[PDB]
Nucleic acid binder design. Structure first.
Ligand SMILES: [Zn+2]
Ligand SMILES: [Zn+2]
Lengths: 99, 1332
DNA sequence: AAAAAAAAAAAAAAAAAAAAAAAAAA
DNA sequence: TTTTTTTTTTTTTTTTTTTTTTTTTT
């Protein structure tokens, strides 16, 4: 038996830890990702891999919704995309969003 | 929210637009106080305030002053998030080369200027030169120079001529090159030049140049002039626990700033040419190491001697951000434990230990708590819940009132391995899981530890309750069978229900209904089962969706009548009036869903579970030693087998037979004895119950527990019960050869040391094979998913008239898969034409579900043209009508729902379950033949003069129920268009030796037969009548080599006999090593001989890879009269001359093969030449798309059917369509794409479609059958490729292409973290698409 | 009969599954 | 005079390339 709701994040990345000796969380594999993709469930996969494993507004506002009793998410965009985008921008690469 | 990401090349104007300052000084932090430095790596005005709304000078900490900058420090008072976002720049005095294009290999720059890489490398690092605007000089424009010949150029051409060195020279070159003239001259060269290497380099150059012209980029942008710099936060300066500051990117930027500042200072001081040369070289190397350290030669070092980290490192490798944080992660609000049953639960609902509920929903409970105001502050609420106070459980029940959750298993093979359920609070420490769904999870209760997740947003709750809900998941995706079939125990109870004992209590009376039947059963006044007439009522829906209630007496068993109550109204009674095997109950569920929809099925299954468990408990179904019976004949049979094997061994000792033959006969007789034992024990088992009938005696089906178990299909099979009672057959050895001595003993008796030892060899081999198969299946499944990640349904109907043809399948025996199964749920492409001809049996573009399929079946429809995904004309997707039904759902497939992933996953799931003469016609019918070319032999029988002939037995109705491949010259007692009795031997032949049967009759003259040089006279020692023997090429002299052995038939006059249909004589040439039997002066009859011519899972994986076989079965490229060519130039040459087309095509063959076709045969293309393994690509390029697809589906279906698992063909259809997405152009036509250019099919398809929509013509193409892995590599989704084993080449190609990457694709949306454009998000995205 | 282009088969190079003390430069 | 750098106290697979052989045309 083991579970976790809100513990510590890993140093290298803001993801839940694993195992029992340290209070981690269950590991979501990529085949589980494919299965989620197999179902039409879209929001579930996004939030699971994003807020249940990051965005400051997403997790804070989720705390506000849940404590308020609301069950709803502003998906927004998880800043890691911005990290990659500006890393590429540092390189001589004109990569950008579009309309 | 938005659409396709756009990539392109950075530009100095773009750079300064993004940047908002220059870091003109290399400082980072004061390191005396903690404030930063002005215009350092950490700067305030350039980037922003470190703290939240606080000027560095501190003039404005107030939110009222938000946005307005100070003046003491010039710092815009704003959140420090701006520091995370604001880029910067560095102005470079000298142009800097972008290392990525320098060593992309193919280097973009080296081949864009058409220059070797070593020379341009030498020029860049300031040890050479390059001519710029050479003009009227002795120096080519592209020429490079060094110091001595630079001085020579200065001497001879110190005038106007200019030659530069370094990145500045390269930038000048890139500015001084023309695009349209280059395209023109290169196109002319491609048109005229005929050197394949030249053609290759030119097509690459032209594709790059025309793409860059299509791009808005400019070539100098490949040369860096202003260097963007990261925002400081993304290059943090972490102070360790002490007076030390450990990111290397800060060091790299400091070094670059120092080098650039020193270069500026030297230029101001005007240092000599060599010093500025060296400074520029060092700056170039610093920039290179900053971008890519180690891409160049010996890299710079970090701490002691270990390499530091660069931007490529940040992006590349496992630690690279794609592979670092876009992969299987860990998840909060997640749990795991071993699982149990709790059968009293319902499939719409699941168990969950109370403690897990407590910890999982802490924020939820806090929200409800502060709503109730039990403890306002969150810390107090945390204290209350961890104390586990009284009121908290009410809150837990409230939140769990409606809040489904996800249950999951580790080896998530197929998608039911994740599933939504409603928790119920259960004490203890284990998760109660519904029984039946475990079978979908294939998760025994050995101790499997399943995990649990919780959705957060109401939309996710909607998805789970609506999509991942067991109610919404009852049928398999692989095919329509209910995945909720009961497995092993409850099936025993139900089998116990619908089985009769001839005489017991409650035998021989009558009842008015099932209710009193249960009453009498529970009373113990009657037996659980006995033949009894009882009135029952059924409610039939034959009317237009209207119930009709009828009633009548039916003979039945008491348990059967008791079961009748649980049936819903719609179903009839005959369905329950059988023994109710696992297959029988499976089709019971199938009927229930197909007639009554979903909710009645759910309720029916729940009650089936409950009642069957209860009555299995009532059963007392046990097992004991006595319950297994060993027939006494086992002793006698074994004695006979021992005597026989001793006799055969003695015969071998007598020398009559060989050791191999001795062993073969021994194993044969042992197997026969084992079969006798199996029959004896099965007879002893099945009908052992022999008892009074209420009279004297009767024998009925046996009530021994083991036969009830086996026949019920609860577990096991005939083989295992055979092992239990009788001998466990013959075991093989580790080498795999079957062992001569079988396992004489049986499990019920003791097993000797040796038999157990050999059985252990076998079992351990099986176990290791299972482990290896598990690993290989996992890897192959990974491949299948990643190749097919992209495909998604995007359109309803392609409006195409074209589809595949579907028919039943007969290998040469029983039909193995009927038409009903293959055609179900699929939209017809062409209407069905019954043989009431001029009958449109069904419309042309309608779905075919079970009622329509049964209509077709009773109509005896044999071949049906149906829509297929491969024939879909959907641009960048698939049409729904092309796909048909979405199995696991009733309605046709819905828009947007992707299918590639589920298809791959379904086909891969059984990867664990896989494994690592003459004919007697049975049926009665008329005779039909295909590929028919026959003749009546001398004896009057029909022999076939066509190798590819096949016999069909047209049944009485008219359909081909039987099909068998007829070899050449077979013996037929009958002919085509005739009647054959069932069980009459007409199909017979001699498989050995290749006949030389003659088309015509006449004298057989020695036309071109030289004796002693070409042929040899070999005398037979048995009879005396010898036969001329033709030698092979090598054995004879070369003089006789060209001298062909030819047999030309002539009439009585000696003139050539003209074969009907042509004028050529009946010349019958012979190959080498041919025994010419007949001699001169003999007339022959027609069809008369002249001479005596002497897999598992890896197989499926290779078929996906489409790997060429060891010896392919060569086919005819082009139709026409065949003919022989040059001889023994390594291979023999054949040429096909079309009667009107163009002959010159020649094909080499290793003539050691047993060839098929004769020299003077006219054939159609795609005709077998050598026989053996058949490649797919030849089939594609000769037969077409349909032929190869049909072969692949047939083979893979055969494999999976052999292993006993059924998968709908559509999954293979889609994987094949993806596998062939690429193609090669045949002619450019009016299009600009080059002749040999390889392009993805959809691109050229839309291109030539629009071009032909105008007055212009389209283009010619040829689809290419690319291996699955190669196809995965060849994908326009570079973001996928970027996360696929490399970044350098991928991003270079993307930038030079500047490809607007479509959100189309699946992993990419996950990688960037945006929503899937497949399910709900698709619809949402369409709104975004509607917005833009 | 001989020169040169093209094929393919073998080989090998690249990728993927540590601390202490002295000298030099700022 | 202080701090940073340099030197002394693993095997397998795949792909890329190059060489030689074979075919063709002059
Ligand atoms: Zn200020
Ligand atoms: Zn279509």
């Amino acid at each position: 038996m083991h579970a976790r709701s809100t513990g510590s994040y890993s140093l290298v990345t803001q993801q839940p830890l694993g195992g029992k000796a340290q209070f981690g969380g269950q590991r979501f594999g990529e085949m589980e990702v494919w299965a989620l993709e197999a179902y039409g469930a879209a929001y579930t996969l996004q939030e699971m891999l994003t807020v249940k494993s990051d965005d400051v507004n997403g997790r804070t506002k989720m705390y506000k919704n849940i404590v308020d009793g609301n069950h709803q998410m502003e998906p927004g965009m998880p800043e890691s995309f911005n990290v990659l985008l500006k890393e590429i921008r540092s390189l001589g690469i004109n990569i950008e969003l579009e309309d | 929210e938005f659409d396709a990401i756009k990539i392109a090349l950075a530009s100095p104007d773009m750079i300064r637009s993004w940047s908002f300052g220059e870091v003109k000084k290399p400082e980072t932090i004061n390191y005396r106080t903690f404030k930063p430095e002005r215009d350092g790596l950490f700067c305030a005005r350039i980037f922003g305030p470190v703290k939240d709304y606080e000027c560095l000078c501190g003039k404005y900490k107030r939110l009222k002053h938000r946005g307005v900058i100070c003046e003491k420090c010039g710092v815009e008072v704003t959140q420090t998030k701006v520091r995370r976002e604001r880029m910067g720049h560095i102005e470079l005095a000298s142009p800097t080369a972008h290392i990525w294009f320098l060593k992309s290999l193919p280097s973009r720059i080296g081949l864009l200027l058409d220059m070797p890489l070593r020379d341009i490398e030498r020029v860049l690092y300031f040890e050479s030169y390059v001519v710029i605007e050479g003009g009227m000089t002795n120096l080519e424009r592209q020429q490079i120079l060094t110091e001595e010949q630079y001085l020579d150029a200065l001497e001879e051409f110190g005038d106007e001529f200019d030659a530069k060195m370094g990145a500045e020279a390269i930038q000048a070159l890139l500015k001084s090159m023309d695009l349209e003239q280059e395209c023109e001259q290169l196109r002319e060269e491609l048109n005229e030049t005929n050197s394949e290497t030249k053609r290759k380099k030119l097509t690459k150059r032209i594709k790059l140049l025309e793409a860059f012209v299509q791009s808005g980029n400019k070539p100098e942008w490949m040369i860096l002039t202003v260097l963007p710099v990261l925002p400081p936060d993304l290059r943090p300066l972490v102070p360790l626990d002490g007076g030390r500051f450990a990111s290397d990117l800060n060091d790299l930027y400091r070094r670059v700033i120092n080098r650039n500042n020193r270069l500026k200072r030297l230029l101001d001081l005007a240092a000599p040419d060599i010093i500025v040369r060296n400074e520029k070289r060092m700056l170039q190397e610093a920039v290179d190491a900053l971008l890519d350290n180690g891409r160049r030669g010996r890299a710079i070092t970090g701490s002691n001697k270990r390499p530091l980290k660069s931007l490529a490192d940040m992006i590349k490798g496992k630690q690279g951000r794609f592979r670092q944080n876009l992969l299987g992660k860990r998840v909060d609000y997640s749990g795991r434990s071993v699982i149990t049953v709790g059968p009293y639960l319902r499939l719409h609902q699941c168990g969950l230990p109370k403690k897990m509920a407590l910890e999982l929903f802490k924020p939820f409970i806090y929200g409800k708590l502060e709503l109730r105001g039990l403890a306002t502050t969150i810390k107090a609420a945390k204290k209350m819940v961890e104390r586990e106070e009284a009121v908290v459980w009410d809150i837990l029940d409230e939140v769990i009132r409606e809040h489904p959750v996800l249950l999951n298993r580790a080896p998530t093979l197929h998608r039911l391995g994740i599933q939504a359920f409603e928790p119920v609070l259960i004490e203890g420490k284990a998760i109660q899981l519904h029984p039946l769904v475990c079978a979908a999870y294939n998760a025994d209760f050995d101790g499997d530890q399943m995990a649990v997740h919780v959705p957060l947003t109401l939309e996710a709750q909607l998805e789970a309750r609506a999509l991942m809900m067991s109610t919404n998941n009852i049928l398999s995706p692989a095919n329509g069978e209910p995945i909720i079939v009961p497995s092993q125990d409850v099936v025993l109870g139900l089998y116990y229900m619908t089985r009769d004992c001839v005489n017991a209590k409650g035998e021989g009376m009558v009842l008015t209904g099932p209710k009193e039947a249960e009453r009498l059963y529970r009373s113990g006044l009657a037996s659980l089962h006995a033949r009894v007439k009882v009135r029952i009522t059924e409610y039939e829906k034959d009317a237009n969706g209207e119930l009709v209630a009828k009633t009548s007496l039916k003979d039945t068993t008491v348990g059967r009548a008791i079961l009748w109550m649980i049936v819903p109204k719609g179903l009839p009674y005959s369905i329950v009036n059988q023994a109710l095997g696992k297959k029988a109950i499976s089709k019971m569920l199938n009927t229930c869903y197909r007639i009554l929809g979903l909710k009645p099925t759910v309720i029916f299954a729940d009650q089936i579970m409950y009642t069957g468990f209860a009555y299995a408990a009532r059963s007392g179904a046990s097992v004991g030693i006595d319950d297994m019976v060993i027939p006494e004949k086992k002793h006698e049979i074994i004695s006979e087998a021992e005597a026989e094997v001793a006799e055969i061994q003695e015969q071998f000792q007598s020398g009559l037979v060989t050791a191999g033959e001795r062993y073969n006969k021994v194993i044969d007789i042992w197997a026969a004895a084992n079969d006798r034992v199996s029959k004896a024990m099965m007879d002893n088992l099945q009908t052992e119950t022999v008892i009074n009938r209420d009279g004297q005696e009767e024998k009925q089906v046996s009530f021994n527990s083991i036969y009830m178990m086996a026949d019920s299909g609860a577990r096991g099979s005939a083989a295992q019960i055979r092992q239990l009672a009788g001998m466990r057959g013959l075991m093989a050895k580790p080498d795999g050869s079957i062992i001569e001595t079988p396992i004489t003993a049986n499990f019920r008796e003791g097993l000797n040391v040796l038999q157990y030892f050999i059985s252990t060899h076998g079992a351990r081999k099986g176990l290791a094979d299972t482990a290896l198969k598990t690993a290989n299946s996992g890897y192959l499944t990974r491949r299948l998913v990643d190749v097919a990640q992209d495909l998604v349904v995007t359109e309803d109907d392609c409006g195409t008239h074209e589809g595949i043809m579907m028919t039943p399948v007969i290998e040469g025996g029983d039909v193995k898969e009927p038409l009903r199964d293959r055609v179900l749920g699929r939209v017809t492409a062409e209407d069905v034409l019954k043989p009431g001809t001029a009958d449109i049996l069904v419309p042309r573009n309608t779905l075919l579900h079970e009622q329509w399929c049964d209509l077709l079946e009773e109509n005896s429809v044999d071949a049906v043209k149906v829509r297929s995904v491969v024939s879909c004309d959907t641009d960048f997707g698939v049409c729904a009508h092309c796909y048909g039904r979405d199995l696991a759902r009733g309605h046709i497939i819905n828009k947007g729902e992707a299918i590639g992933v589920i298809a791959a996953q379904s086909i891969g799931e059984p990867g664990t379950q896989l494994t690592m003469s003459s004919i007697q016609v049975k049926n009665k019918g008329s005779i039909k033949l295909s590929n028919v070319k026959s003749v009546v032999n001398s004896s009057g029988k029909l022999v076939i003069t066509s190798r590819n002939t096949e016999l069909k037995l047209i049944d009485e109705f008219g359909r081909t129920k039987e099909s068998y491949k007829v070899p050449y010259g077979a013996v037929l007692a009958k002919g085509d268009g005739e009647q054959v009795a069932g069980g009459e031997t007409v199909a017979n032949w001699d498989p050995h030796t290749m006949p030389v049967i003659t088309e015509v009759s006449g004298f057989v003259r020695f036309t071109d037969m030289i004796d002693g040089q070409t042929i040899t006279r070999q005398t037979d020692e048995l009879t005396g009548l010898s036969s001329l023997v033709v030698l092979d090429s090598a054995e004879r002299t070369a003089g006789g080599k060209d001298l062909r052995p030819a047999l030309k038939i002539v009439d009585a006059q000696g003139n050539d006999v003209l074969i009907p249909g042509t004028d050529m004589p009946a010349q019958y040439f012979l190959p080498g090593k041919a025994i010419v039997q007949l001699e001169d002066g003999v007339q022959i009859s027609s069809g008369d001989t002249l001479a005596r011519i002497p897999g598992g899972l890896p197989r499926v994986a290779d078929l996906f890879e489409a790997r060429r076989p060891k010896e392919p079965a060569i086919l005819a490229e082009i139709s026409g009269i065949v003919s022989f060519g040059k001889e023994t130039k390594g291979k023999r040459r054949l040429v096909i001359t079309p009667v009107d087309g163009s002959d010159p095509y020649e094909e080499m063959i290793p003539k050691w093969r047993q060839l098929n076709v004769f020299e003077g045969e006219r054939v159609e293309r795609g005709d077998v030449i050598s026989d053996g393994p058949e490649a797919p690509h030849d089939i594609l390029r000769l037969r077409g798309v349909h032929a190869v697809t049909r072969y692949i589906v047939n083979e893979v279906q055969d494999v999976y059917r052999l292993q006993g698992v059924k998968i709908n063909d559509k999954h293979i259809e889609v994987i094949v369509r993806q596998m062939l997405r690429k193609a090669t152009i045949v002619n450019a036509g009016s299009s600009d794409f080059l002749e040999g250019e390889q392009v993805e099919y959809s691109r050229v398809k839309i291109a030539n479609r629009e071009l032909e929509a105008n007055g212009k013509v389209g283009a010619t193409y040829s689809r290419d059958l690319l291996g699955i892995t190669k196809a995965s590599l060849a994908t326009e989704s570079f973001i996928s490729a970027a996360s696929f084993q490399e970044t350098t080449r991928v991003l270079t190609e993307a930038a030079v292409a500047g490809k607007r990457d479509e959100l189309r694709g699946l992993k990419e949306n996950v990688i960037v973290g945006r929503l899937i454009p497949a399910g709900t998000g698709y619809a949402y995205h369409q709104d975004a698409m509607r917005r833009r």
